[PDB]
Protein backbone atom coordinates (compact mmCIF):
# COMPACT_ATOMS: atom_id res chain seq x y z
CA UNK A 1 0.00 0.00 0.00
CA UNK A 2 1.19 3.54 0.79
CA UNK A 3 4.35 4.52 2.66
CA UNK A 4 4.26 7.81 4.63
CA UNK A 5 7.39 9.94 4.46
CA UNK A 6 8.59 12.66 6.80
CA UNK A 7 6.13 14.36 9.13
CA UNK A 8 2.87 16.20 8.36
CA UNK A 9 3.40 19.97 8.52
CA UNK A 10 1.00 22.82 9.25
CA UNK A 11 1.64 25.56 6.69
CA UNK A 12 -0.55 28.22 5.07
CA UNK A 13 -3.67 27.16 6.94
CA UNK A 14 -3.37 23.58 5.68
CA UNK A 15 -1.86 20.29 6.76
CA UNK A 16 0.63 19.04 4.16
CA UNK A 17 1.64 15.37 4.28
CA UNK A 18 3.50 13.19 1.81
CA UNK A 19 3.37 9.50 0.88
CA UNK A 20 4.50 7.28 -1.94
CA UNK A 21 3.01 4.11 -3.37
CA UNK A 22 3.17 2.00 -6.51
CA UNK A 23 3.02 3.88 -9.83
CA UNK A 24 -0.57 4.76 -10.75
CA UNK A 25 -1.93 4.12 -14.22
CA UNK A 26 -3.42 7.40 -15.42
CA UNK A 27 -6.00 8.52 -17.96
CA UNK A 28 -5.12 10.34 -20.19
CA UNK A 29 -1.69 8.65 -20.18
CA UNK A 30 0.12 11.77 -21.41
CA UNK A 31 -0.66 13.73 -18.25
CA UNK A 32 2.44 12.34 -16.55
CA UNK A 33 5.08 9.65 -16.84
CA UNK A 34 3.53 6.25 -17.66
CA UNK A 35 3.18 3.91 -14.70
CA UNK A 36 5.06 1.16 -16.54
CA UNK A 37 8.14 3.42 -16.84
CA UNK A 38 8.05 4.53 -13.19
CA UNK A 39 9.16 3.24 -9.79
CA UNK A 40 6.73 5.05 -7.44
CA UNK A 41 3.85 7.50 -7.34
CA UNK A 42 4.71 10.49 -5.15
CA UNK A 43 1.69 12.09 -3.48
CA UNK A 44 0.99 15.25 -1.50
CA UNK A 45 -2.04 15.06 0.79
CA UNK A 46 -3.14 18.66 1.40
CA UNK A 47 -6.17 19.39 3.57
CA UNK A 48 -7.47 22.53 5.24
CA UNK A 49 -6.49 22.96 8.87
CA UNK A 50 -8.71 24.33 11.60
CA UNK A 51 -9.32 28.07 11.26
CA UNK A 52 -8.21 28.12 7.63
CA UNK A 53 -8.65 31.73 6.51
CA UNK A 54 -9.34 31.04 2.81
CA UNK A 55 -12.87 29.58 3.08
CA UNK A 56 -12.13 25.85 3.38
CA UNK A 57 -13.60 23.71 6.14
CA UNK A 58 -11.28 21.59 8.28
CA UNK A 59 -10.35 18.39 6.44
CA UNK A 60 -11.43 19.65 3.01
CA UNK A 61 -9.16 18.98 0.07
CA UNK A 62 -7.69 22.29 -1.09
CA UNK A 63 -8.05 22.37 -4.91
CA UNK A 64 -6.39 24.41 -7.69
CA UNK A 65 -3.07 24.63 -5.83
CA UNK A 66 0.26 24.79 -7.67
CA UNK A 67 2.41 22.01 -6.21
CA UNK A 68 5.97 21.57 -7.50
CA UNK A 69 8.90 19.60 -6.19
CA UNK A 70 12.62 18.98 -6.06
CA UNK A 71 13.57 15.37 -5.25
CA UNK A 72 17.21 14.83 -4.27
CA UNK A 73 19.02 11.51 -3.95
CA UNK A 74 21.12 12.59 -0.98
CA UNK A 75 23.57 9.72 -1.46
CA UNK A 76 24.96 11.21 -4.70
CA UNK A 77 23.36 14.65 -5.22
CA UNK A 78 21.08 13.78 -8.17
CA UNK A 79 18.13 16.20 -8.36
CA UNK A 80 14.92 15.61 -10.33
CA UNK A 81 12.19 18.23 -10.58
CA UNK A 82 8.60 18.54 -11.70
CA UNK A 83 5.03 19.43 -10.80
CA UNK A 84 2.43 17.33 -9.03
CA UNK A 85 -0.79 17.11 -10.98
CA UNK A 86 -4.25 17.14 -9.39
CA UNK A 87 -6.08 13.87 -9.90
CA UNK A 88 -8.76 11.65 -8.45
CA UNK A 89 -8.38 8.08 -7.18
CA UNK A 90 -10.75 5.80 -5.34
CA UNK A 91 -9.87 7.39 -1.97
CA UNK A 92 -10.45 10.93 -3.25
CA UNK A 93 -8.47 13.70 -4.94
CA UNK A 94 -4.78 14.33 -4.38
CA UNK A 95 -1.71 15.91 -5.99
CA UNK A 96 0.85 13.46 -7.35
CA UNK A 97 3.41 12.38 -9.94
CA UNK A 98 4.76 9.09 -11.28
CA UNK A 99 8.56 9.12 -11.02
CA UNK A 100 11.59 6.99 -11.84
CA UNK A 101 13.93 6.95 -8.84
CA UNK A 102 17.73 6.62 -8.78
CA UNK A 103 18.07 3.37 -6.83
CA UNK A 104 17.83 2.60 -3.12
CA UNK A 105 19.03 5.07 -0.52
CA UNK A 106 18.18 8.32 1.20
CA UNK A 107 16.01 10.92 -0.52
CA UNK A 108 14.79 14.42 0.27
CA UNK A 109 11.46 15.54 -1.21
CA UNK A 110 11.01 19.31 -1.14
CA UNK A 111 7.50 20.55 -1.94
CA UNK A 112 6.74 24.07 -3.13
CA UNK A 113 3.06 24.98 -2.66
CA UNK A 114 1.51 28.15 -4.10
CA UNK A 115 -2.13 29.27 -3.83
CA UNK A 116 -4.69 29.06 -6.65
CA UNK A 117 -3.93 32.61 -7.79
CA UNK A 118 -0.70 31.15 -9.24
CA UNK A 119 -2.38 28.42 -11.31
CA UNK A 120 -1.53 28.85 -15.00
CA UNK A 121 -3.72 26.02 -16.27
CA UNK A 122 -6.97 26.99 -14.50
CA UNK A 123 -8.08 30.36 -13.12
CA UNK A 124 -9.59 30.41 -9.62
CA UNK A 125 -11.09 33.40 -7.82
CA UNK A 126 -11.36 34.62 -4.23
CA UNK A 127 -14.21 36.66 -2.79
CA UNK A 128 -12.98 39.89 -1.19
CA UNK A 129 -16.05 41.85 -0.14
CA UNK A 130 -17.23 42.26 3.44
CA UNK A 131 -20.27 40.00 3.16
CA UNK A 132 -18.78 36.92 1.44
CA UNK A 133 -15.03 37.57 1.42
CA UNK A 134 -12.20 35.51 2.84
CA UNK A 135 -8.69 36.40 3.93
CA UNK A 136 -5.79 36.77 1.50
CA UNK A 137 -4.17 33.71 -0.03
CA UNK A 138 -1.27 32.23 1.90
CA UNK A 139 2.17 33.20 0.67
CA UNK A 140 4.00 30.28 -0.99
CA UNK A 141 5.27 27.66 1.45
CA UNK A 142 7.88 24.91 1.31
CA UNK A 143 8.01 21.58 3.16
CA UNK A 144 10.65 18.83 3.24
CA UNK A 145 10.27 15.05 3.71
CA UNK A 146 13.29 12.75 4.09
CA UNK A 147 12.97 9.01 3.54
CA UNK A 148 14.89 5.83 2.73
CA UNK A 149 13.82 4.03 -0.45
CA UNK A 150 14.33 0.27 -0.48
CA UNK A 151 13.10 -0.76 -3.93
CA UNK B 1 -29.27 34.35 -0.99
CA UNK B 2 -32.25 33.07 -3.00
CA UNK B 3 -32.53 29.46 -4.24
CA UNK B 4 -33.41 28.90 -7.90
CA UNK B 5 -35.69 26.01 -8.79
CA UNK B 6 -34.94 22.59 -7.33
CA UNK B 7 -31.64 20.73 -6.91
CA UNK B 8 -31.21 18.00 -9.49
CA UNK B 9 -29.41 14.66 -9.32
CA UNK B 10 -27.33 14.49 -12.49
CA UNK B 11 -24.04 12.79 -13.35
CA UNK B 12 -23.57 11.42 -9.84
CA UNK B 13 -23.81 14.90 -8.35
CA UNK B 14 -26.36 17.22 -6.77
CA UNK B 15 -26.61 20.38 -8.89
CA UNK B 16 -28.36 23.36 -7.30
CA UNK B 17 -28.53 27.02 -8.30
CA UNK B 18 -28.75 30.18 -6.19
CA UNK B 19 -28.31 33.91 -6.65
CA UNK B 20 -27.27 36.65 -4.26
CA UNK B 21 -25.93 40.20 -4.41
CA UNK B 22 -22.97 40.77 -6.76
CA UNK B 23 -19.63 39.71 -5.28
CA UNK B 24 -16.28 41.48 -5.35
CA UNK B 25 -13.62 39.00 -6.44
CA UNK B 26 -9.91 38.89 -7.07
CA UNK B 27 -8.58 38.93 -9.76
CA UNK B 28 -11.31 41.54 -10.30
CA UNK B 29 -10.72 41.93 -14.03
CA UNK B 30 -11.81 38.33 -14.59
CA UNK B 31 -15.46 38.88 -13.65
CA UNK B 32 -18.01 41.55 -14.40
CA UNK B 33 -17.57 44.32 -11.79
CA UNK B 34 -19.99 44.08 -8.89
CA UNK B 35 -21.07 47.69 -9.45
CA UNK B 36 -22.09 46.85 -13.04
CA UNK B 37 -24.06 43.74 -12.05
CA UNK B 38 -27.47 42.88 -10.61
CA UNK B 39 -26.76 39.48 -9.04
CA UNK B 40 -24.10 36.85 -8.47
CA UNK B 41 -25.28 33.58 -10.02
CA UNK B 42 -23.95 30.44 -8.34
CA UNK B 43 -23.94 26.77 -9.27
CA UNK B 44 -23.58 24.52 -6.21
CA UNK B 45 -22.27 21.15 -7.39
CA UNK B 46 -21.66 18.46 -4.75
CA UNK B 47 -20.98 14.74 -5.03
CA UNK B 48 -23.96 12.50 -4.37
CA UNK B 49 -23.91 9.12 -2.66
CA UNK B 50 -21.97 6.32 -4.35
CA UNK B 51 -20.11 8.72 -6.64
CA UNK B 52 -18.07 6.87 -9.27
CA UNK B 53 -15.34 9.50 -9.71
CA UNK B 54 -13.74 9.15 -6.27
CA UNK B 55 -15.62 11.84 -4.34
CA UNK B 56 -17.28 11.42 -0.97
CA UNK B 57 -20.90 12.45 -0.54
CA UNK B 58 -21.08 16.22 -0.10
CA UNK B 59 -17.63 16.99 -1.53
CA UNK B 60 -17.31 19.94 -3.89
CA UNK B 61 -16.51 18.67 -7.39
CA UNK B 62 -13.58 20.73 -8.76
CA UNK B 63 -12.17 21.32 -12.25
CA UNK B 64 -15.53 21.09 -14.01
CA UNK B 65 -16.47 23.11 -17.09
CA UNK B 66 -19.64 25.01 -16.23
CA UNK B 67 -21.55 27.44 -18.47
CA UNK B 68 -25.01 28.97 -18.45
CA UNK B 69 -27.78 30.33 -20.65
CA UNK B 70 -30.25 32.79 -19.11
CA UNK B 71 -33.50 33.68 -20.87
CA UNK B 72 -35.75 36.55 -19.78
CA UNK B 73 -38.99 34.77 -20.59
CA UNK B 74 -41.01 38.00 -20.65
CA UNK B 75 -39.29 39.24 -23.82
CA UNK B 76 -37.12 36.34 -25.01
CA UNK B 77 -33.78 38.01 -24.31
CA UNK B 78 -31.03 35.36 -24.21
CA UNK B 79 -27.71 35.79 -22.37
CA UNK B 80 -24.82 33.30 -22.29
CA UNK B 81 -21.78 33.04 -20.07
CA UNK B 82 -19.33 30.87 -18.17
CA UNK B 83 -18.91 30.29 -14.46
CA UNK B 84 -15.56 30.54 -12.83
CA UNK B 85 -14.48 28.48 -9.82
CA UNK B 86 -13.88 30.58 -6.72
CA UNK B 87 -13.90 30.44 -2.94
CA UNK B 88 -16.03 32.50 -0.56
CA UNK B 89 -16.57 32.35 3.19
CA UNK B 90 -18.95 29.37 2.78
CA UNK B 91 -16.55 27.37 0.62
CA UNK B 92 -15.86 26.94 -3.09
CA UNK B 93 -18.46 27.36 -5.81
CA UNK B 94 -18.87 28.09 -9.52
CA UNK B 95 -20.06 31.67 -9.99
CA UNK B 96 -20.50 34.71 -12.21
CA UNK B 97 -21.65 38.29 -11.71
CA UNK B 98 -24.57 38.95 -14.06
CA UNK B 99 -26.47 41.96 -15.37
CA UNK B 100 -30.11 40.93 -15.81
CA UNK B 101 -32.86 42.52 -17.94
CA UNK B 102 -35.23 43.78 -15.26
CA UNK B 103 -37.90 42.11 -13.15
CA UNK B 104 -39.77 39.11 -14.44
CA UNK B 105 -39.48 35.39 -15.04
CA UNK B 106 -36.18 33.82 -16.11
CA UNK B 107 -35.15 30.39 -17.37
CA UNK B 108 -31.66 29.22 -16.36
CA UNK B 109 -29.85 26.39 -18.13
CA UNK B 110 -26.66 25.10 -16.52
CA UNK B 111 -24.28 23.20 -18.80
CA UNK B 112 -22.02 20.97 -16.69
CA UNK B 113 -19.20 19.06 -18.37
CA UNK B 114 -16.39 16.97 -16.90
CA UNK B 115 -12.75 18.02 -16.83
CA UNK B 116 -10.88 17.72 -20.10
CA UNK B 117 -9.51 14.20 -20.57
CA UNK B 118 -7.34 14.73 -23.68
CA UNK B 119 -4.10 16.58 -24.45
CA UNK B 120 -5.49 19.69 -22.67
CA UNK B 121 -6.23 17.87 -19.40
CA UNK B 122 -5.45 19.36 -15.97
CA UNK B 123 -7.14 16.88 -13.68
CA UNK B 124 -6.37 13.21 -14.12
CA UNK B 125 -8.11 9.92 -13.39
CA UNK B 126 -6.49 6.87 -11.83
CA UNK B 127 -7.57 3.75 -13.73
CA UNK B 128 -5.62 0.79 -12.37
CA UNK B 129 -7.17 -2.00 -10.32
CA UNK B 130 -5.91 -0.80 -6.93
CA UNK B 131 -6.71 2.92 -7.12
CA UNK B 132 -8.87 3.50 -10.17
CA UNK B 133 -12.27 5.13 -10.51
CA UNK B 134 -15.06 5.12 -13.05
CA UNK B 135 -15.32 7.26 -16.18
CA UNK B 136 -16.20 10.92 -16.10
CA UNK B 137 -19.92 11.64 -16.30
CA UNK B 138 -21.39 12.51 -19.67
CA UNK B 139 -22.17 16.24 -20.01
CA UNK B 140 -25.48 17.23 -18.43
CA UNK B 141 -27.91 20.13 -18.61
CA UNK B 142 -29.95 21.28 -15.60
CA UNK B 143 -32.96 23.59 -16.04
CA UNK B 144 -34.40 26.06 -13.56
CA UNK B 145 -36.92 28.89 -13.54
CA UNK B 146 -37.31 31.79 -11.13
CA UNK B 147 -38.96 35.19 -10.78
CA UNK B 148 -36.56 38.10 -10.28
CA UNK B 149 -38.03 40.94 -8.23
CA UNK B 150 -35.51 43.62 -9.20
UniProtKB/Swiss-Prot annotation, chain B:
Keyword DNA repair carried by entry: no
Keyword tRNA processing among record annotations = no
Keywords for this protein: Signal
* Family recorded in the similarity comment: Belongs to the UPF0423 family.
Protein's name according to its UniProt entry:
UPF0423 protein BRA0381/BS1330_II0378
Amino acid sequence: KEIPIGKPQLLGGMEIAAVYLQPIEMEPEGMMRPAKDSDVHLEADIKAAKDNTNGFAEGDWVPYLVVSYELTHLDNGKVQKGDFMPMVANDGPHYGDNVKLDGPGKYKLKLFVSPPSANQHAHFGRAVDKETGVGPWFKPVTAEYEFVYAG
